[PDB]
Amino acid sequence: AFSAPAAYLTHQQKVLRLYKRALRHLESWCVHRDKYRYFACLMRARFDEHKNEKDMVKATQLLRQAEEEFWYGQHPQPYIFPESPGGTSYERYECYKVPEWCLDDWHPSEKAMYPDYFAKREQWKRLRRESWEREVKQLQEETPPGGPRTEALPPARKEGDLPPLWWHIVTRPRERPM
């Protein structure tokens, strides 16, 4: 979610993803903690005796049959965390997330209450206004010719600089605003 993705997944990434999926779906199958621990250790061992395979063709036929076996035994109703993309509260609080620019449209009588908050907000807006003019030039000078190759942004390299394109990352509404 936070880290930028690459052009592809290497073999070790696929191995680790299959390991995670297998363990999670096994936990979904064997519910009790002791049974799950036993069968997870057995799965790790069954996942381990092929660790030192050297040639890549065998290591590709392997984990390709394993994916088929996983798809056969995947427990069509796996356990999902409540806030996960399949969970029962995945986007429950997404309707309470209000943008920060909405504060700009408040009536002056509304802004009369919470004066300290709006003073701090004005300080933040001034900081953003200067930092933007700095970071545009930083990004223009740092980007390779022909445009970016990955979705990676560089850190601020000077003292008074701020990371380029920082406003909409640090000014997120909240995880649960209300």
Binding site: A1, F2, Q74, P76, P85
Partner: protein, 104 residues
């Protein structure tokens, strides 16, 4: 649009789309609020066969049970006044044929 990566940081998180990427012709048909094509644990044909078999078997068995109804070993209920002729329909100016019940 449901089977796109849910963990990627899209520009449109709910639609799972990026600014400037081609939209697709039938975007409004795949919006996670409508028909999705995500792979299922069971094959489509297997699911179709199982559902159709269950429904057809239930229909056939209900028809069979209609052929072979269940009941208790008793006679029909007896209602006193000419099978309650007046209380069901009336017509008191006709003098219906007297039907009477047998006491055992």
């Amino acid at each position: 649009q449901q089977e796109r990566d849910p963990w990627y940081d899209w520009d449109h998180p709910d639609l799972r789309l990026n600014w400037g990427e081609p939209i697709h012709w039938d975007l409004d048909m795949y919006i996670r609020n409508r028909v999705d094509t995500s792979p299922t644990p069971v094959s489509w044909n297997t699911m179709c066969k199982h559902l159709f078999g269950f429904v057809a078997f239930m229909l056939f068995m209900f028809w069979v049970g209609e052929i072979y109804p269940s009941y208790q070993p008793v006679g029909p209920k007896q209602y006193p006044y000419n099978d309650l002729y007046l209380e069901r329909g009336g017509d008191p100016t006709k003098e219906p044929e007297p039907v009477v019940h047998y006491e055992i």
